[PDB]
Amino acid sequence: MMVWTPVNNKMFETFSYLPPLTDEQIAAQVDYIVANGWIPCLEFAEHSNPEEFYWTMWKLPMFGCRDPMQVLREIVACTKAFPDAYVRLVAFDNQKQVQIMGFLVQRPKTARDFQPANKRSV
Amino acid sequence: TKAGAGFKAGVKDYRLTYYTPDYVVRDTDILAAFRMTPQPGVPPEECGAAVAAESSTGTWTTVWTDGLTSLDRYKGRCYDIEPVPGEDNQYIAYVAYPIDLFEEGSVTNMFTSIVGNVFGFKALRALRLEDLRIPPAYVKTFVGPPHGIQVERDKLNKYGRGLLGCTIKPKLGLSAKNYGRAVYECLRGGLDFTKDDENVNSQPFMRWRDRFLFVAEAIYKAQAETGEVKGHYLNATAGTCEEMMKRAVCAKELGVPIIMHDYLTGGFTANTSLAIYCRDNGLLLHIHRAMHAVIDRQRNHGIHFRVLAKALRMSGGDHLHSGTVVGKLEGEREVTLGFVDLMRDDYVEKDRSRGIYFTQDWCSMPGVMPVASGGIHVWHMPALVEIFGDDACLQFGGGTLGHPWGNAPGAAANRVALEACTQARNEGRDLAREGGDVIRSACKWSPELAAACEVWKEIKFEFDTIDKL
Amino acid sequence: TKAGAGFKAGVKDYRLTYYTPDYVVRDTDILAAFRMTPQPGVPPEECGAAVAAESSTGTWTTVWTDGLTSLDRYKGRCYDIEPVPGEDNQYIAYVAYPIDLFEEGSVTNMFTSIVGNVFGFKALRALRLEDLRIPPAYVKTFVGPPHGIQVERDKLNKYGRGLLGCTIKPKLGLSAKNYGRAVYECLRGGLDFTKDDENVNSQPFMRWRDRFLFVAEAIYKAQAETGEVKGHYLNATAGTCEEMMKRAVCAKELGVPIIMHDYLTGGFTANTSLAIYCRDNGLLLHIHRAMHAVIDRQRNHGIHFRVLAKALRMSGGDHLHSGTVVGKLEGEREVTLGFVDLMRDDYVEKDRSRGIYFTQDWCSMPGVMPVASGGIHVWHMPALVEIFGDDACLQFGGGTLGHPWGNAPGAAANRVALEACTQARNEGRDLAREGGDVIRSACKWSPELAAACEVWKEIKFEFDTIDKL
Amino acid sequence: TKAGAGFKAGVKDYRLTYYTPDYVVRDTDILAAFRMTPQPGVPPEECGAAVAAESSTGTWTTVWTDGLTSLDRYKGRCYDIEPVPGEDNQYIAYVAYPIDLFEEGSVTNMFTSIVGNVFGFKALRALRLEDLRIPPAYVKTFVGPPHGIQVERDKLNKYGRGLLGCTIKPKLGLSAKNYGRAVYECLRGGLDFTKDDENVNSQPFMRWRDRFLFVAEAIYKAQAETGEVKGHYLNATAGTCEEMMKRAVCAKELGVPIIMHDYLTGGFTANTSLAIYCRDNGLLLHIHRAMHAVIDRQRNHGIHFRVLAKALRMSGGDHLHSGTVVGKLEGEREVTLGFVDLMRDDYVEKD
Amino acid sequence: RSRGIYFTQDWCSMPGVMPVASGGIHVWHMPALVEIFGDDACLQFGGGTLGHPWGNAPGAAANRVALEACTQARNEGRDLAREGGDVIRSACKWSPELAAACEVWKEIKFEFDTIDKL
Numbered sequence A: 001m002m003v004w005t006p007v008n009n010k011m012f013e014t015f016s017y018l019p020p021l022t023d024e025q026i027a028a029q030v031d032y033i034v035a036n037g038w039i040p041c042l043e044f045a046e047h048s049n050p051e052e053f054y055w056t057m058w059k060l061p062m063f064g065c066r067d068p069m070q071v072l073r074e075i076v077a078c079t080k081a082f083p084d085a086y087v088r089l090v091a092f093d094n095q096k097q098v099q100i101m102g103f104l105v106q107r108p109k110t111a112r113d114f115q116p117a118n119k120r121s122v
Numbered sequence B, C: 001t002k003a004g005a006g007f008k009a010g011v012k013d014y015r016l017t018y019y020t021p022d023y024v025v026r027d028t029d030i031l032a033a034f035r036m037t038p039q040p041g042v043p044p045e046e047c048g049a050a051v052a053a054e055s056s057t058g059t060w061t062t063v064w065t066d067g068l069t070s071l072d073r074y075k076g077r078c079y080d081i082e083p084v085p086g087e088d089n090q091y092i093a094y095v096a097y098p099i100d101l102f103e104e105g106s107v108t109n110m111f112t113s114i115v116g117n118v119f120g121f122k123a124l125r126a127l128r129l130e131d132l133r134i135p136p137a138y139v140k141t142f143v144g145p146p147h148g149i150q151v152e153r154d155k156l157n158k159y160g161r162g163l164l165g166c167t168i169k170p171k172l173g174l175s176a177k178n179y180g181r182a183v184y185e186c187l188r189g190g191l192d193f194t195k196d197d198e199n200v201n202s203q204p205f206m207r208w209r210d211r212f213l214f215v216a217e218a219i220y221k222a223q224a225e226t227g228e229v230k231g232h233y234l235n236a237t238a239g240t241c242e243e244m245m246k247r248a249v250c251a252k253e254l255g256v257p258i259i260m261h262d263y264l265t266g267g268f269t270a271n272t273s274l275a276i277y278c279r280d281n282g283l284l285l286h287i288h289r290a291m292h293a294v295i296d297r298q299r300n301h302g303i304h305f306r307v308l309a310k311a312l313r314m315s316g317g318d319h320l321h322s323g324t325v326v327g328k329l330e331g332e333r334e335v336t337l338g339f340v341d342l343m344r345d346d347y348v349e350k351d352r353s354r355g356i357y358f359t360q361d362w363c364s365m366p367g368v369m370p371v372a373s374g375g376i377h378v379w380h381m382p383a384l385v386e387i388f389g390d391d392a393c394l395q396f397g398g399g400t401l402g403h404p405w406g407n408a409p410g411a412a413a414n415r416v417a418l419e420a421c422t423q424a425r426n427e428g429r430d431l432a433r434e435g436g437d438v439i440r441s442a443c444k445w446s447p448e449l450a451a452a453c454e455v456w457k458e459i460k461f462e463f464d465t466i467d468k469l
Numbered sequence D: 001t002k003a004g005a006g007f008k009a010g011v012k013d014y015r016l017t018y019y020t021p022d023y024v025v026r027d028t029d030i031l032a033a034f035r036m037t038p039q040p041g042v043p044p045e046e047c048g049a050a051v052a053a054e055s056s057t058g059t060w061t062t063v064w065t066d067g068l069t070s071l072d073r074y075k076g077r078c079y080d081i082e083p084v085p086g087e088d089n090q091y092i093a094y095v096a097y098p099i100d101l102f103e104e105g106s107v108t109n110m111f112t113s114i115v116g117n118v119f120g121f122k123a124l125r126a127l128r129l130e131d132l133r134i135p136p137a138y139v140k141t142f143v144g145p146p147h148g149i150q151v152e153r154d155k156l157n158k159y160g161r162g163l164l165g166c167t168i169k170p171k172l173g174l175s176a177k178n179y180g181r182a183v184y185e186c187l188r189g190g191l192d193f194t195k196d197d198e199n200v201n202s203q204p205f206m207r208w209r210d211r212f213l214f215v216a217e218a219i220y221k222a223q224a225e226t227g228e229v230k231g232h233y234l235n236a237t238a239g240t241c242e243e244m245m246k247r248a249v250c251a252k253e254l255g256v257p258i259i260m261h262d263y264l265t266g267g268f269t270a271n272t273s274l275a276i277y278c279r280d281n282g283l284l285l286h287i288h289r290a291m292h293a294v295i296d297r298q299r300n301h302g303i304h305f306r307v308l309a310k311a312l313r314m315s316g317g318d319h320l321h322s323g324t325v326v327g328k329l330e331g332e333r334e335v336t337l338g339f340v341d342l343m344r345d346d347y348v349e350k351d
Numbered sequence E: 001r002s003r004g005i006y007f008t009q010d011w012c013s014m015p016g017v018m019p020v021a022s023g024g025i026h027v028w029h030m031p032a033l034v035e036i037f038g039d040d041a042c043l044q045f046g047g048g049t050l051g052h053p054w055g056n057a058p059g060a061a062a063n064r065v066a067l068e069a070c071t072q073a074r075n076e077g078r079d080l081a082r083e084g085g086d087v088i089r090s091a092c093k094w095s096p097e098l099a100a101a102c103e104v105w106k107e108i109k110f111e112f113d114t115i116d117k118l
């Protein structure tokens, strides 16, 4: 029996219970956005609290973007400008008018409030 | 200067007034598809006409008062009858009802006409309401769901995957303190929701308000620990409207984001009131369909679940249980896919291969989140993600509280399984074919999931389907 | 030092915990009799156990939380299984539920446990709840009917005969002014009551408040003209509890003695609230059973009407439709006599020949007045008086408004027929044998009755019965 | 991987998005017919498109937020433009509005979109809303009139002839006691109704509750004397909703069968509330159209009375003034016959 | 009468209502708006914000800079009716957010014959 730790075990919604996403895994997610015709967008924040609905938009949603390389370049640009911020990639569906995917692509390095995968239970 | 049509006392055939095979249906008519089994010697046209008559304006003998009004304007009309393939004595009778027959915004009234008396007529052996065409002009008279799928996701700030829930167990017999204990341990391991069992209301072993308070503490603690928004569907189902409202009011005061209601055992009148209260107060409303299988299981008689689902959508609910297909309770794949579309989508074309008898236009009424619940576990995850997609909540009660390491590891196992399937799908993997591989890889990586994989490895629910198309 | 019973994760058979054939039922247990059809390969003991488990404390796999409470204390128990004569795969499974499982005064809660989920289990092909034993200790938690038979008669000042009612027709399509017109003409001819059709709520052709006002005028005029107390069941059935209550409040304001509610389409939660309101305000409450046959028609699946009738008695109603036996809707004689006793009497002994599976003690909860309505006319009168006795209301909608001379003559015909039969019975005449002679003599004497006799002379409703014991 | 339609900042012509002459109207669309007079140099198609845009989803420059939603689904659409016979610079522009644009049961909201801002656009010289097609799916969202013609006749027990009424005069300046005096003498001679003047509310010369009580006495005396059902439209028109309701409640308590309201000076929001109250309490509701001619007199600019009448029908009223044709206030015969049909009938064909 | 005021109006201390200038205005209009209304007004830019090429926050900033530059210039004695363009041009050169707004709407004017004339 392993015990799931309550200590510094914060999660960040979709994909946080998986191993950290590789560059190839992130790229595959971006392909999924493009294949489905959804609108990519980046958002960022100094802090991440479950009670806080809005983050700050990086520029504007990438309307009409069908180029995965463009999305990956904006990830680099956003994280470069805010190297200590939480950054997430999201995508919008304008037909249902709702966010249709989203996951973290950066966390602060000074953050020690979450566990590596093999340290989540003791 | 002859006499026109006058009052003639006595009995004549219903078909003389109520079978109109040349009737062109109006865009504002409510349409019904009845699977009808006549008694020997009762012509199908007379049977369909009887059903149309006694669900609209007619009775068993001629009444003089018809002359004061216009029967043509108000009568229900059996406008088509088709034989059922593979049956010698089953027919689909199609009945059109003028919009004037119905009280605006009242599912109760609609059911009272269409299914009120006709199922007990001696002249038929069996009757099943298969589908209803709710016209936009009638749909528009309903408040509808308090929020609906898009608004719900926005209120939860949850995107990109199915939601995960869990009924606390044992069903009955736990104290309020133990209920909250179980809830906290469940939510902290990665579940978005837990819930009261449908029959957990207020009882000698656990009074409702004691539960509500402890569950609120549990929600808050798990939310703070995990950094993710949590909820627990607190049951407002009660013996009276006043008790039900008291419970909803208390949940609102506690600031808990979601409650539940058993719409069929509580009833449509109570449910509509509750839905309106939830709209007026920003409460998410989970609907449990307790008692539906009493009505909807048998092919020859009752009301198909798709009609009970449409009725809930109208009365109002943010979630509604949809079956699992693969779990402990019945629900055939194509049937389920059909009513899932009817629950979620804005416009659903007629498709008899999915049990959709009419094209349904919901005219922007919000979609209802399907909830797959009942005897499912980690090995079902790929099939569930494949069937439902992201816009569903998947619930694991036994599949969480039955985990050998307890609730938090159980929740973690389910959350890892869902996320691995979601990722795999997004990457282009075919879950119908490679689902087992996705779970097997995930089991090897996550010790919590592995423990779940081992205990339930052999467990399947495969039986002959009763509710077949 | 060695361990006792610990937590073991995984699936085991329900029968290991939930089949207890040596259990001695307690006098406070709720008992259920399920007519159960297992899937091939599922032992009846496991099927019965699954039903008991999943309507009480259990789910599909073992949960650790059982250990925090006492499953012995709370679990539902299948304590007996009998094969059904003439069936190879049907069994009556008897389940006992501890009183602690149920919310006091809540029919909604009792149905949610007993009929909530189990009818949809894949492991069974069909399930029918035949009967419930409601123990006095649970019965005592319910307000029950607002008045009951004896109080009702005292409030109406009516004694010594069946009551007479009549649904206004056409069902829908009449204006408020025409509704009141029909009502006045009906009541003034000798009917005690008229009523809204079950589906007459509030609609474009007739809004409810307009109707309520005209009907009140009609009641008052007919009462003053005849010198007898009159009533008309104004329909409170509505889309929401708030609308339902608004209607009941208006009826009270108008001083009308009686209202009606459709308890199944409105729902038990709304119905209980309304019954309490009726008790608190001295309103008689007529209950219409719209939708019951969706649930109670088929022998193999659903809930027998006797259970729906017990549930209504608990939730609350002064009248409840009982069927006619001889009219247009189904109801077999012995089955009907059984549940009529369950509706009216204080103590009813087990009697399988009448579908009574358990001795039922109502511990002085008031009796509900049976209402025989639907496709009946003057020639049925002797049979009706014979079946029901005086404690019933007999309703003639078409049998009044279908009279060739109009409503008042139609009412008079029914009243004369009822009184002739009543007198004959009181004189020692056997209505079962001499009923035709009583009506024939009455037709020769009363021209109003004669006209009814002639028009409906040949009209009978005789069909093979679906709901057979 | 070449880019699709993205966000481009700046001003472009409204017609690029909002003039859709091939659009097939949906049976749930609200349709408007605008009599439009463009400024010199403004193409009618651009003018029609500007009207459609700024009464639905659009503003004067391109906004990036359009991309988050579906403009196709929500936009108003100028779908047809016809020149007006006998005019060199007047056009009828037809605009279709999706049903999703409107709040259910709210005339206020419908007017806010369709007539809210567009009449003040510099780019036009004049605008008149001539007609609206209210689809059944939108009509069904309204409570509508408290009773309507047939129910009213049944409640009054009056059949087979026109009803007769009479405004008390002088308009203002009579005491409550003299008001009731005049009412009784009027009603006893054979009138079915009398009424407060539109501007008789509550004033220093006569407070409302004093009047209501005297009028109730007059109604009762005349009804007893003549043997015929009498009424007097007591005015609930007030400065606030709360005063309005107070007045209606008092009329109800007195058992008087009918009240009145000035729907345009009181306003649609108050009027709808009042109509609902009248439905819930069996009060007949007489609607006075005070201020309509400010809006509806001129051919080139405003809103035709037929639209104001449709709006009243939706908001709720049992009576509505229609004009006389032959009396002191304007109302051409054919125009009047048209909107009278629109007020009374169930189905009225284009004409 | 030259301002359409037909009667002397005494409000006897009833509070004043804040005028709101809104509808088809952008950064280049700022000097004229400040000159017409003074400080006791609210100036609203819907399209003039949500139509900014960089999104809402830059759009808002451009409007706020423009308003502040005009306000400062006025307080310093500058004649906004005459030098208003110069104030905006200076501010565009200084603030990249404003510059982007200046460029996009540079040519945009609404000048038509007036219907509601005195």
Ligand SMILES: O=C(O)[C@@](O)(COP(=O)(O)O)[C@H](O)[C@H](O)COP(=O)(O)O
Binding pocket: B167, B169, B197, B198, B289, B290, B321, B322, B323, B324, B329, B371, B372, B373, B374, B375, B376, B395, B396, B397, B398, B399, C054, C059, C060, C117, C120
């Ligand atoms: O009482 C139960 O069995 C459940 O709590 C599931 O528990 P488990 O998660 O432990 O199976 C759900 O209420 C059922 O799934 C309802 O059935 P349905 O969704 O078909 O209406």
Ligand SMILES: O=C(O)[C@@](O)(COP(=O)(O)O)[C@H](O)[C@H](O)COP(=O)(O)O
Binding pocket: B054, B059, B060, B117, B120, C167, C169, C197, C198, C289, C290, C321, C322, C323, C324, C329, C371, C372, C373, C374, C375, C376, C395, C396, C397, C398, C399
């Ligand atoms: O709607 C009808 O058919 C009735 O008004 C009968 O009309 P008639 O008197 O003209 O037959 C009653 O509601 C039915 O008897 C209800 O059925 P039950 O009593 O079986 O529930």
Ligand SMILES: O=C(O)[C@@](O)(COP(=O)(O)O)[C@H](O)[C@H](O)COP(=O)(O)O
Binding pocket: D054, D059, D060, D117, D120, E020, E021, E022, E023, E024, E025, E044, E045, E046, E047, E048
């Ligand atoms: O709906 C519009 O057009 C506006 O939102 C402005 O939008 P933009 O800022 O995008 O121009 C305002 O409501 C108008 O100013 C109203 O006109 P007025 O102020 O004259 O009453």
Ligand SMILES: [Mg+2]
Binding pocket: B167, B196, B197, B198, B199
């Ligand atoms: Mg449950």
Ligand SMILES: [Mg+2]
Binding pocket: C167, C196, C197, C198, C199
């Ligand atoms: Mg009926």
Ligand SMILES: [Mg+2]
Binding pocket: D167, D196, D197, D198, D199
């Ligand atoms: Mg006047």
